Each structure stands twice: as structure tokens, then as C-alpha cells.
Write a protein that binds this ligand. Structure first.
Ligand code: HEM
Length: 151
């Protein structure tokens, strides 16, 4: 990533990273509002969530959110050279395959991330901040898709 984009990403992540579950909760609430057909993909204790709010009562799901936020934090930490996370991210792509999940829904998850950032940052969500994040998310997804497919 470019050296100005890198700083915008670090500075913007700071407030989010202080309360990662509260913020991931926004991300996932937004996700299920946009695309409730993703809700059945998250199954714990042999059961489907009926409503999006049901997910937010599941300690397994909230623990899932914490994992997501930890991986985003890792991409932020390595933003100036994401090749250091390449092999992890390819492994993450394989995992999405292993559980029977394809990644054509990646753009919606991305929009959900950007939504959470916009709401957290308010006026500090500049256009430059948005494009930095979209570029980081894209690079993450492209590494994940390598692992999902051959390689
Ligand atoms: C592309 C659309 C996506 C869908 C539909 C999706 C869905 C899922 C599902 C269903 C699981 C399994 C949950 C479980 O049984 O506990 C999972 C795991 C995971 N997802 Fe995603 N996901 C997507 C993209 C992403 C992206 C872009 C990230 C980036 C941080 C991410 C991070 C994770 C992590 C960290 C796990 C847990 C990995 C592990 O336990 O080893 N996902 N995802």
C-alpha cells in the first residue's frame, strides 16, 4: 500500500480497535440487513439463526466477530507490506471453502466494513480514507481468493 494510504488506515483503525466487538457488531448487523441470506451460513450447536438479532445473542458468533476483527487488525498492522500476511490470507480463503462458503458475497462484506468505518469516523471518513480502505479490502480479498482457488 502507498505511504499516505497506510497512515490514513492506521489512524482510522485506532478508534475501532479500542472496542472491537462493538464495532464488529455494527459490521455484522449491517451485513445481515443488506443480505439476510448470509445468516444461515453461521450455524452453532446444530441450529440456524431465525433473525439477525438472534446472532447477536450467540457467544459463538460474537467470538466469530472477534476473530474477524483480529484478522483486520493484522492487515492494518501489515498495511505497508501485505505480502507478510499472504500465506495466512490464502489459508483463510481455503477455510472459507472448507466450510462450504464461496466468496461472491465479498463486495457486500466489504460494504459492511466501509459502513462501520463511515459511522465510527463521521467527518473523519474522508474520500481518501474510503479509497484507502477499499484498496486494502480488495488486496485482502484477492489473497483470500488465491487460496480459495488453485495455489
Ligand atoms: C466473502 C464473503 C464472506 C462470507 C460469506 C463469510 C462467511 C464466513 C463463514 C460462514 C465462516 C464460518 C463461521 C463459523 O462456522 O464459525 C467464516 C469464517 C471466517 N471469516 Fe468469513 N466470510 C466472508 C469473507 C470474509 C472476509 C473478507 C474476512 C476477512 C477478515 C473473513 C474472516 C473470517 C474469519 C477470520 C473466519 C474464521 C476463520 C477460522 O476460524 O479459521 N471472512 N466466514
Amino acid at each position: 500500500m502507498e505511504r499516505p494510504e497506510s497512515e490514513l488506515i492506521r489512524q482510522s483503525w485506532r478508534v475501532v480497535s479500542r472496542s472491537p466487538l462493538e464495532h464488529g457488531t455494527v459490521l455484522f448487523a449491517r451485513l445481515f440487513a443488506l443480505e439476510p441470506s448470509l445468516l444461515p451460513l453461521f450455524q452453532y450447536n446444530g441450529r440456524q439463526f431465525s433473525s439477525p438479532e438472534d446472532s447477536l445473542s450467540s457467544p459463538e458468533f460474537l467470538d466469530h466477530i472477534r476473530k474477524v476483527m483480529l484478522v483486520i487488525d493484522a492487515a492494518v498492522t501489515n498495511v505497508e507490506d501485505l505480502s507478510s500476511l499472504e500465506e495466512y490470507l490464502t489459508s483463510l480463503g481455503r477455510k472459507h471453502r472448507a466450510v462450504g462458503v464461496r466468496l461472491s458475497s465479498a463486495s457486500t462484506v466489504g460494504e459492511s466494513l466501509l459502513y462501520m468505518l463511515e459511522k465510527s469516523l463521521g467527518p473523519d471518513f474522508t474520500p481518501a480514507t474510503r479509497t484507502a480502505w477499499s484498496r486494502l479490502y480488495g488486496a485482502v480479498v484477492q489473497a483470500m481468493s488465491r487460496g480459495w482457488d488453485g495455489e
